[PDB]
Amino acid sequence: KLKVAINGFGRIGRNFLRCWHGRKDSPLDVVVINDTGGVKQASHLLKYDSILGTFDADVKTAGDSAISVDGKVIKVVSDRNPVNLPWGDMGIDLVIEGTGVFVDRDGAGKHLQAGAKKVLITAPGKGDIPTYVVGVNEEGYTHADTIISNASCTTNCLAPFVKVLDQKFGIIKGTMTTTHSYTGDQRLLDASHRDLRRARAACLNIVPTSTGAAKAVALVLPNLKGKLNGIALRVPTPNVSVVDLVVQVSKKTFAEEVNAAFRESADNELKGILSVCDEPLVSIDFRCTDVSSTIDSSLTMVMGDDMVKVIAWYDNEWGYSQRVVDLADIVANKWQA
Amino acid sequence: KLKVAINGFGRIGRNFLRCWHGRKDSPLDVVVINDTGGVKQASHLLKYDSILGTFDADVKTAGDSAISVDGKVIKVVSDRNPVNLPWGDMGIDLVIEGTGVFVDRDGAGKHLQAGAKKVLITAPGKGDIPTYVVGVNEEGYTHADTIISNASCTTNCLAPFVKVLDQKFGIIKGTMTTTHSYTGDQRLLDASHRDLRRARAACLNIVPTSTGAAKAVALVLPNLKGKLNGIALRVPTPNVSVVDLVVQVSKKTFAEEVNAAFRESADNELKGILSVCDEPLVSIDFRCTDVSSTIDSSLTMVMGDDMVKVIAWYDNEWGYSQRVVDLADIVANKWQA
Amino acid sequence: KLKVAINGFGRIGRNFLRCWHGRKDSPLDVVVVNDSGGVKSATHLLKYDSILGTFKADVKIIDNETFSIDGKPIKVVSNRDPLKLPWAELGIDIVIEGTGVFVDGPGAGKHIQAGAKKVIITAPAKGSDIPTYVVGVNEKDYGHDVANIISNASCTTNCLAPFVKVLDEELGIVKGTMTTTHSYTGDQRLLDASHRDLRRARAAALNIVPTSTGAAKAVSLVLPQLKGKLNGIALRVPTPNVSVVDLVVNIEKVGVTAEDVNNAFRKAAAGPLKGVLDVCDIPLVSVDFRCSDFSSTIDSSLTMVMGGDMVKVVAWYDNEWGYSQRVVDLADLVANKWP
Amino acid sequence: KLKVAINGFGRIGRNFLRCWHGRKDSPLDVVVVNDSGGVKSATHLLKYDSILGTFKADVKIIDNETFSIDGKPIKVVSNRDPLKLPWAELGIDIVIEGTGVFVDGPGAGKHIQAGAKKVIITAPAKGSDIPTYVVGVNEKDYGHDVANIISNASCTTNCLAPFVKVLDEELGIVKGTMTTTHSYTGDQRLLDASHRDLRRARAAALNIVPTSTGAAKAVSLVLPQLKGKLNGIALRVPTPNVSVVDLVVNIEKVGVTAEDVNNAFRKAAAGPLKGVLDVCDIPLVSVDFRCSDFSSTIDSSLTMVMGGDMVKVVAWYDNEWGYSQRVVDLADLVANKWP
Ligand SMILES: NC(=O)c1ccc[n+]([C@@H]2O[C@H](COP(=O)([O-])OP(=O)(O)OC[C@H]3O[C@@H](n4cnc5c(N)ncnc54)[C@H](O)[C@@H]3O)[C@@H](O)[C@H]2O)c1
Ligand SMILES: NC(=O)c1ccc[n+]([C@@H]2O[C@H](COP(=O)([O-])OP(=O)(O)OC[C@H]3O[C@@H](n4cnc5c(N)ncnc54)[C@H](O)[C@@H]3O)[C@@H](O)[C@H]2O)c1
Ligand SMILES: NC(=O)c1ccc[n+]([C@@H]2O[C@H](COP(=O)([O-])OP(=O)(O)OC[C@H]3O[C@@H](n4cnc5c(N)ncnc54)[C@H](O)[C@@H]3O)[C@@H](O)[C@H]2O)c1
Ligand SMILES: NC(=O)c1ccc[n+]([C@@H]2O[C@H](COP(=O)([O-])OP(=O)(O)OC[C@H]3O[C@@H](n4cnc5c(N)ncnc54)[C@H](O)[C@@H]3O)[C@@H](O)[C@H]2O)c1
C-alpha cells in the first residue's frame, strides 16, 4: 500500500522483492528500482535465483524502462546518484540503499534531496546511524526516525535471543565469530580491494575478517557494551550461514535449559523470528527459512555452567530480506503520513 | 633406515610418503603398503596430488606388485585383514593404520599377530590408547609403548601451545571449534552413514560435528580435563583448516603479549612445530607448511584479559603427515631394537 | 494403484519418491524401500535434500522399520541380498534397481526369485539382455511379457536419444560424436581415493573428469539405425547437478540452417514430445534448469552449423529429476501394459 | 635485458611475473607495474597466489610506490589513465595490457603517446587492426616496425591454433566446431550480479556457463585457410583454474585412425613444437596439469574418430600459466626483433 522504492538492486533487493510479492498482504508497495544494470537484464536476473531458482511468477519488462510482476509493473531506473532518481518525482516515501556506498547520513540525504521521505539501509549504518531490529528496538522506532539502517543479517540474527540470554541468566561477557559465506564484498578472483582478505579470490578460501556485530550488538544493546567482540569468517560457500558464540553468563545453568528457554522465546516473541533446530541439519536445511535464527539446541553447550557455546543459523539475504519486510511494515506502522 | 610399513593408504599415507621421500635423512624406511586399491592405480594416484599436484619424483610400478620411487621400490599389497599382511614375512617393525577401522587395541593386534613389532595410528585411538604428540608427550614415549596412536591433526595442532598457554597464564577453561574441511568421513553426495551430518553430501554444505579433541586435549593433558569441550565444523573446503578458540585464563593479559609468547615458543620448542602468522592470509597461504600451527597473532584477541580468542591453522594431512614423520623418528629413537 | 518397491534408495530414488508423492495421480504404489541405512536416517535423507531441499510436505517415522510420509506410511528394507527382500511377501510387481549393482539380467532376476513380478533397471545394463526402454523412443515399443525385466540407461542417454532421433528423422544425420557435461556423482571420489577408474577416482569437487558414457552405444541400441553412428565422452564437472550435453553432427540434408531446426526442435518438443522435450530461447546457465521435468531443454542461441551439414546442438537435463520423471511415466505405462 | 612494464596487474600479469622471475635468462626487464590497488596489497597479492601460492622466493616492499622482489626492485604505477603512465619517463619499450580495456588499437596507442615504444595485447583485439601474434603460428611471421603494436588473443585461441594447424597441414581438416571447458574468471560473477552477458552474469562458482570465444575467429584470423572453418562455444566451468577443450573435425584425408595422429601429434609436439605442445598418454584430469608450460597437452586415450574423417581431439592448457609463458617468449622474440 505504502509507496516504496529500492536502490542498489543487489541480490539483497532481489530476494527482498521475491518475499514482498510472496508477502501475505504486503502493506507496502515498491514502485521503482535503481541499479547500474538494465531493465531486461535485471528482469532475467531476478527471474532466476541461483539458490531458490526461478521466480514462481512471470516477470516481464512491462515497458522498456519498467518490468511487470505478473502484471505488477515497477519502474526500473539505473544511476549512481540519488539526486538523479525519481524520489520527488514519484513521490517516493522510502528509498532502500542497497549500493552499500551511502553508508553515511549524507548518502541517504541525497535521496531526500531528490524528494525522499524516509531512507532505510540494508547495511550497518557507518557512523551514528540508527538500526532497528524486530523484537529488539523496533518499538523504539518513531515516525521521527526517518533515517534508520539495518546491520548485517549476521548481527540481526544474534541480537534478540542473546539479549534474552543476558535477560535469562545475565551474560557477563563473551565473544563470537560466524561461519559467514563469501559475497561480492570479497573479489571473485584475487582482485584489488580495500581488504586483502576481501581482495582475495576466496572462492576456494576461508576468509578471516570481522563485522560491526561485535559493536552492533553493543550498538543495539548499549547494555552489551564490550561484553562481546566477535569476528567474521567468510567461508567458501555462497549461502546461509550459522554463528558460533560462547558467552559468560552470571547465572549458572545447563545447555538444555537454555535451549528450552530458546524454544519458549521462539514461541512468545521470537516466534517467526527464531527457530530451534534439534535435528542434524546443515546449511541446505535452513534455506528460505523466515525465522532469522535456527537454534541448534541439539548441539549448544555450556562450560562451567556459564560459558555457553551456541549454534544458530541465519540466511545471508532471505531471512535478512524478511527482516527488511517487517521493519518496513513497522514503518508503515506509525505512518499517519 | 628402520623398516616401516603403512596400512590403509589414504591420502594421509600418500602425503606421508611424499614427505618421507622428501624427508631430509629419513632415519626410517617404509617397505610395503596395504590398501584396497591396486598397484598402478595407487601409483598413478599418489603421482598426482590434487593440492600439491604431481609428485616431484618418478614413481613407477617396479614390479606388478610393487612400485619404485625413483628406483626406491616398495611392495604394494591389498587386503582388509592385517593377518593377511606380510608383517612377520617382511619382518615389519611398524604398521601404520590408515584404514581407520582398527581404532581398537585388537585391530592393531592383528598386525602383531601377523608379525608386527609396533603399530602406530593416524587416528584418535578409540578407547584407552596412547597418543604421543611432539613437544607434548613424545618424551613420555617409551620403547615399551609398542601400541600408540595419533589423534586428528586438529587435536595435535591445539595441544602444545594451548598447553603452554595454560603454562603461560593458566587457562581456567574455555571451549573451541574448528573450521575443519570435509573428507571421506563425510559422504560425497548424500549417502547413508552412521552420522547424518557425515552422511550429508556436504560438498556444498558446512557440517556441524565434533571431535575427540574436546577430550583428546584432556587426554594428552589430564590437567586439561574438562577445561575445554569443543566441536567440529566440517567446512565445504577440501583443504588445510584453521581453528577457533576462546579460553578463560587465570592470569590477566592482552592478546599481543600472548602472540609474542607464541612466537617465543615457536622459537624455543614450537619452532618447526608452530608458526606465528601476522599477514592477512587464508587457507592457500598455509599449504605444505610443516609447522603444525600458524598463529594468526594479527587477529587473536582477549576478552576481559582472560577470555582469549585465538586463530591458528593446521594442514589436514601434510602437517599431520609431518607429525607422523617425526613421531616415527622418535620411535626410531629409543630403538635399541 | 500398483505395488512398487525401490531397490536401493539412491539419491536417484530419493528424487524419484519426491516425484511420486509429487505426482498427480501416480498409478503406482511404492510401499517399501531398500537401503541398508536405517529408517531414521532415510527419513532424514529424503526429508533433507541438497539439490532442492526438504520434502515440501511432512515425513514421519512410524515403527523404525517402516516410516511414513504425510500419513501415508512406507515400509523399508535394508539389505544387499536380493533374495532377502520380501518381494514375495510384499507382493511387489516391480523392482527399482537404485544401486547399479545388478547391471546383469540375473542380478535382477534374483529379486524376481524373491517374489518380484518385474524389474526395471535405473541404469544401463552392462549386458544387453535387458530392454533399455526409453520414453518417446521405445516406450511405445514396450510389450508386456516381452522381457518383463526391462532396463533404462542413464539420463545422459535418455536426454539425447529421442530428439536426436527426430533430428535424423526430419533432417537425417550422417553421424556425430557427442560430449556432455556430467556433474560428479557418488562413483566419483570427493577426494582422491582408492577406486577403479583413475579419472573419477580423483577428488571430484576439484576436477573436471574425462570419462565416457555407455550412451553412444545405448543410443545405437535404441536407434539401430544409429549403430556406430555416435561416439562421445563424459565430462564430469565438479558441480552438484545440472546435466548438459553438446554434439555436432553432419546432417544428411542439403546443409540447412540450425535456426530452422530449432524451430522444428521446439515444434516436435511442442508436438509429439510435449513435456518430454523442451527447446527454450532464453539465454540461461546451469542453475537455470534446476528441477525441470523436461528430459531436455535446447536453447536456440546455442545450436549452430559449421558446414551446412556440420551442425551443433546444446541442451540440458537433470540426471535424476527428469530421469526420475522418466521412471515414473514408464512405470505408469508399464502399469497400463500391466494386466 | 629490455625495459618492460605490465599495464594492468591482472592475475594474468601475476602469473606472468612469476614466470619472468621464474625465467632462466629473461631478456626483458619488467620494471614498473600498473594497477590502481596499492603496492602493499600488490606485493601481498603476487606474494600469495591461489592457483599455486606464495612466490617461491622473497618479495619485499621498498618505498610503497615501489616494492621489490628478492632484492630486485620493481616500480609500480596505479592508474586507469594511459597518458598518466610514465612510459616516456620510465622509457618502457612495451606495454602489457593486463586489463582487456584497450581492445582497440587507439587505446593502446594512448600509452605509446605516453612514451611507449611498443604494445602487446594480452587478449583478443576487438578490432582487427592489431596482429594477434601467436607462438608456433605467426611468431615467425612477426616483423619489427610491422605494426609494432601487436596483439595476442586468449589462451583459448593460442592453445588450439598451432597444433590444429599442423593437423590440417599433415592430414587436412575439412572443417569443425570446437568447444572448450573454460574456468570462471573475474568477468564472471561470483554471485548473480549486474552484468552485461546474462550468462557469466550469474553466480560463477555454481554454474557452468554457455558462452562463446573469439577463438573460432582468431584461429581463422591466424589461419586464413581456416576462414569460417571453425566455430565453437565457451563453456565456463566453476572450476578453480584449469583450461581444456575438445573438438571433432572432418579430416581431408582418407579417413585415418586417430591413433596414428596422436603419434604424429606427439611427434610434432616433440618436433617443431617442443615445449610448446604436449601429447601426454597418462589418463589424467584437471588438476593433473597445474602449472604446465605446455600450451597444450593431448591425451591419446581421448582423441578419437567418428566417421574416418570425423575425428575428435582433447587437450588442456592453463589460461594464464601457459599463456604467461607465451607472453614471455613472444616478447623475447620481440626483443630479438627489437633493435
Ligand atoms: N551478502 C548479503 O546478502 C548481505 C547481508 C548483509 C548485508 N548486506 C548488505 O547488502 C549490500 C550488498 O548487497 P549484495 O551482498 O547483494 O551485493 P551486490 O554487490 O550484489 O549489491 C550492490 C549492487 O548495487 C550496485 N551498485 C553499487 N554502487 C551503486 C551505486 N552507487 N548506485 C547504484 N547501484 C550501485 C552494484 O553494481 C550491485 O549490483 C551492502 O550494503 C551490504 O552491507 C549484504
Ligand atoms: N582428513 C584428514 O586428512 C584426516 C584428519 C585427521 C585424521 N585422519 C585419519 O585418517 C584416516 C582417514 O584417512 P583419509 O582422510 O585420507 O581418508 P581415506 O578414506 O582416503 O582413507 C582410508 C583409505 O583406506 C582404505 N581402507 C578402508 N578400510 C580399509 C581396510 N580395512 N583395509 C585396507 N584399506 C582400507 C580406503 O579404501 C581408503 O583408501 C582416519 O583414520 C582418520 O581418523 C585423517
Ligand atoms: N547419478 C545418476 O543420476 C544416475 C543416472 C543413471 C544411472 N544411475 C545409476 O544409479 C545408481 C545409483 O544412483 P546414485 O547416483 O544415487 O548412486 P548412490 O551410490 O548414491 O546410490 C546407491 C545407494 O544404495 C546403496 N546400495 C549400494 N548397493 C546396494 C545394494 N546392493 N542394495 C541396497 N542398497 C545398496 C549405497 O550404499 C547408496 O546408499 C548408480 O550406480 C548408477 O548405475 C544414476
Ligand atoms: N583470464 C585469462 O586467463 C585471460 C586470457 C585471455 C585474455 N585475458 C584478458 O586479460 C584481462 C585481464 O585478465 P584477468 O582475467 O586477470 O582479469 P582481471 O580483471 O583480474 O585483471 C584486471 C585487473 O586490473 C585492474 N584494471 C582494470 N582496468 C584497469 C586499467 N584501465 N588500468 C589499470 N588496471 C586496471 C582491475 O581492477 C583488476 O585488478 C581480461 O580483461 C581479458 O581480456 C585473460
C-alpha distances in Å from residue C116, one per residue of C93, C97, C283, D153: 6, 12, 46, 62
Chain D residues with CB under 8 Å of A14 CB are 192
Has A183 been labeled as part of a binding site?
A: yes
Integer Cα distance of B74 and B87 in angstroms: 14
| Contact assessment for residue B163 and residue B261, using Cβ atoms and an 8 Å cutoff | no
- Neighbouring CB atoms inside 10 A of C34's CB total 28
- Considering only the beta carbons, identify the residue of C9, C37, C193 that sits closest to B184: C193
Partners of A2 in the beta sheet? A28
Q: Specify the residue with its C-alpha closest to ligand 1, atom 17.
A: A10
Ligand 2 proximity of B101 Cβ (cutoff 6 Å)? yes
CATH class entry, domain A2-151+317-336:
alpha beta
Residue type, A60: K
| Contact assessment for residue C201 and residue B45, using Cβ atoms and an 8 Å cutoff | yes
Question: Which of A143, A102, A141 has the alpha carbon at shortest distance from A121?
Answer: A102
Integer Cα distance of D133 and D146 in angstroms: 12
Q: Which of A19, A153, A157, A277 is catalytic?
A: A153
The Å distance, Cα D12 to ligand 4 centre, comes to 7
Integer Cα distance of B274 and B268 in angstroms: 10
Integer Cα distance of D88 and D82 in angstroms: 11
The structural domains of chain D, ordered by start, are 3-153+323-337 (3.40.50.720), 156-318 (3.30.360.10)
Residue type, B148: I
Residue D192 gets which letter from DSSP? S
| Residue listed under C-alpha cell 617382511 | B90
Give the per-residue SS3 of C124-138. CCCCCCCCECCCCCC
Integer Cα distance of A64 and B188 in angstroms: 46
| Contact assessment for residue B333 and residue B140, using Cβ atoms and an 8 Å cutoff | no
Residue type, A228: L
| Contact assessment for residue B123 and residue B151, using Cβ atoms and an 8 Å cutoff | yes
Structural gaps in chain B: residues followed by a C–N separation over 2.5 Å: none
Q: How far apart are the first and last CA of chain D?
A: 12
Q: How far apart are the first and last CA of chain B?
A: 12
Integer Cα distance of C117 and C97 in angstroms: 14
Q: Specify the residue with its C-alpha closest to ligand 1, atom 30.
A: A80
Integer Cα distance of B50 and B316 in angstroms: 13
Integer Cα distance of A202 and A235 in angstroms: 8
Residue D221 gets which letter from DSSP? H
- Neighbouring CB atoms inside 10 A of A218's CB total 17
The length of chain D, given as a count of residues:
339
Ligand 2 proximity of B152 Cβ (cutoff 6 Å)? yes
| Contact assessment for residue C178 and residue C215, using Cβ atoms and an 8 Å cutoff | yes
Beta-strand relationship, A171-173 and A241-249: antiparallel
Ligand 2 proximity of B183 Cβ (cutoff 6 Å)? yes
Ligand 2 proximity of B13 Cβ (cutoff 6 Å)? no
- Considering only the beta carbons, identify the residue of C209, C230, C242 that sits closest to D285: C209
Q: Domains of chain B: which residue ranges?
A: 2-151+317-336, 152-316
Give the per-residue SS3 of chain B. CEEEEEECCCHHHHHHHHHHHHCCCCCEEEEEEECCCCHHHHHHHHHECCCCCECCCCCCCCCCCEECCCCCCEEEECCCCHHHCCHHHHCCCEEEECCCCCCCHHHHHHHHHCCCCEEEECCCCCCCCCECCCCCCHHHCCCCCCEEECCCHHHHHHHHHHHHHHHHCCEEECCEEECCECCCCCCCCCCCCCCHHHHCCCCCCCEEEECCHHHHHHHHCHHHCCCCCCEEEEECCCCCEEEEEEEEECCCCCHHHHHHHHHHHHHHCCECCEEECCCCCCHHHHCCCCCCEEECCCCCEEECCCEEEEEEEECCCHHHHHHHHHHHHHHHCCCCC
Integer Cα distance of A114 and B65 in angstroms: 80
Integer Cα distance of A319 and A19 in angstroms: 10
Q: What are phi and psi of D15, to 5 degrees?
A: -55, -35
Distance from the Cα of D328 to chain B's closest Cα (Å) equals 24
Chain D residues with CB under 8 Å of B285 CB are 48, 53-54
In chain B, whose CA is at the least distance from the CA of A285?
A: B205
The length of chain A, given as a count of residues:
337
Integer Cα distance of B310 and B174 in angstroms: 11
- Neighbouring CB atoms inside 10 A of A146's CB total 16
Question: Which of D336, D288, D327, D339 has the alpha carbon at shortest distance from D23?
Answer: D327
Burial of D5 (0-12, 13-18, 19+ CB in 10 A): buried
Joined together, the cell numbers standing for residue C194 give 582408492
Chain C residues with CB under 8 Å of A48 CB are 284, 287-288
| B38-B40-B42 Cα angle (round to 5) | 60
The technique is cryo-EM
Integer Cα distance of D59 and D67 in angstroms: 8
* Coil/strand/helix, residue A285: helix
Integer Cα distance of B257 and C43 in angstroms: 52
Q: Are residues B48 and D288, on separate chains, in Cβ contact within 8 Å?
A: yes
Q: At what angle do helices D155-170 and D259-270 cross, to 10 degrees?
A: 110
This PDB structure is determined at a resolution in Å of: 6.3
Chain D residues with CB under 8 Å of B50 CB are 287
Residues with Cβ within 8 Å of residue D15, at least 6 apart in sequence: D49, D51, D318, D320, D321, D323, D324
Q: Are residues B246 and A174, on separate chains, in Cβ contact within 8 Å?
A: yes
Secondary structure (DSSP) of C206-263: G--EEEE-THHHHHHHH-GGGTTTEEEEEEEESSSS--EEEEEEEESSS---SHHHHH
| A59-A63-A67 Cα angle (round to 5) | 25
Partners of C291 in the beta sheet? none
Residue type, D137: V
Partners of A301 in the beta sheet? A309
Q: Tell me which CATH code domain B152-316 carries.
A: 3.30.360.10
Q: What are phi and psi of A238, to 5 degrees?
A: -90, 20
- Say whether A152-316 and A2-151+317-336 share the same fold: no
Integer Cα distance of A279 and C54 in angstroms: 13
| Contact assessment for residue A312 and residue B208, using Cβ atoms and an 8 Å cutoff | no
Question: Which of B121, B8, B118, B26 has the alpha carbon at shortest distance from B72?
Answer: B26
- Considering only the beta carbons, identify the residue of C48, C194, C205 that sits closest to B238: C205
Ligand 2 proximity of B8 Cβ (cutoff 6 Å)? yes
User: Is A203 among the residues known to form the active site?
Assistant: no
Burial of C126 (0-12, 13-18, 19+ CB in 10 A): middle
Strand order in the sheet with D149-152: D75-77, D29-34, D3-7, D94-97, D118-122, D149-152
Integer Cα distance of C249 and A281 in angstroms: 47
| Contact assessment for residue D105 and residue D129, using Cβ atoms and an 8 Å cutoff | yes
Integer Cα distance of D232 and C140 in angstroms: 36
* Coil/strand/helix, residue C90: coil
- Neighbouring CB atoms inside 10 A of D54's CB total 16
Integer Cα distance of C80 and C101 in angstroms: 9
Residues with Cβ within 8 Å of residue A70, at least 6 apart in sequence: A21, A57, A58, A59
Q: What are phi and psi of D143, to 5 degrees?
A: -130, 145
Integer Cα distance of C138 and C49 in angstroms: 32
| Contact assessment for residue D189 and residue D199, using Cβ atoms and an 8 Å cutoff | no
Closest ligand to C-alpha of residue A99 is: 1
Atom of ligand 1 nearest to the CA of A317: 3
| Contact assessment for residue D79 and residue D85, using Cβ atoms and an 8 Å cutoff | yes
Integer Cα distance of D121 and C210 in angstroms: 33
| Contact assessment for residue A243 and residue A159, using Cβ atoms and an 8 Å cutoff | no
Distance from the Cα of D159 to chain B's closest Cα (Å) equals 21
Integer Cα distance of A195 and A213 in angstroms: 18
Question: Which of A203, B199, B203 has the alpha carbon at shortest distance from C240?
Answer: B203
Burial of B305 (0-12, 13-18, 19+ CB in 10 A): middle
Integer Cα distance of A212 and A210 in angstroms: 7
Catalytic residue IDs of B: 153
Q: Are residues C41 and B10, on separate chains, in Cβ contact within 8 Å?
A: no
Integer Cα distance of B118 and D143 in angstroms: 70
Integer Cα distance of A124 and A135 in angstroms: 18
Q: Are residues D204 and A188, on separate chains, in Cβ contact within 8 Å?
A: yes
Residue D189 gets which letter from DSSP? B
Beta-strand relationship, A207-210 and A231-234: antiparallel
| Contact assessment for residue B247 and residue B307, using Cβ atoms and an 8 Å cutoff | yes
| Contact assessment for residue C237 and residue C206, using Cβ atoms and an 8 Å cutoff | no
| Contact assessment for residue D98 and residue D10, using Cβ atoms and an 8 Å cutoff | yes
Q: Specify the residue with its C-alpha closest to ligand 1, atom 19.
A: A184
Which secondary structure element, helix H or strand E, spans residue A22, and what is its range? Answer: helix A11-22
C-alpha distances in Å from residue D76, one per residue of A179, D49, D68, D71, D291: 36, 19, 10, 15, 26
Question: Which of D178, D172, D140, D134 has the alpha carbon at shortest distance from D154?
Answer: D134
Integer Cα distance of A19 and A324 in angstroms: 10
Residue type, D320: E
Integer Cα distance of C267 and B258 in angstroms: 72
Residue D309 gets which letter from DSSP? S
Atom of ligand 2 nearest to the CA of B181: 1
Integer Cα distance of C254 and C256 in angstroms: 6
Residues with Cβ within 8 Å of residue A267, at least 6 apart in sequence: none
Distance from the Cα of D15 to chain B's closest Cα (Å) equals 16
Q: Are residues C50 and B201, on separate chains, in Cβ contact within 8 Å?
A: yes
Q: What are phi and psi of C11, to 5 degrees?
A: -50, -35
Partners of D30 in the beta sheet? D4
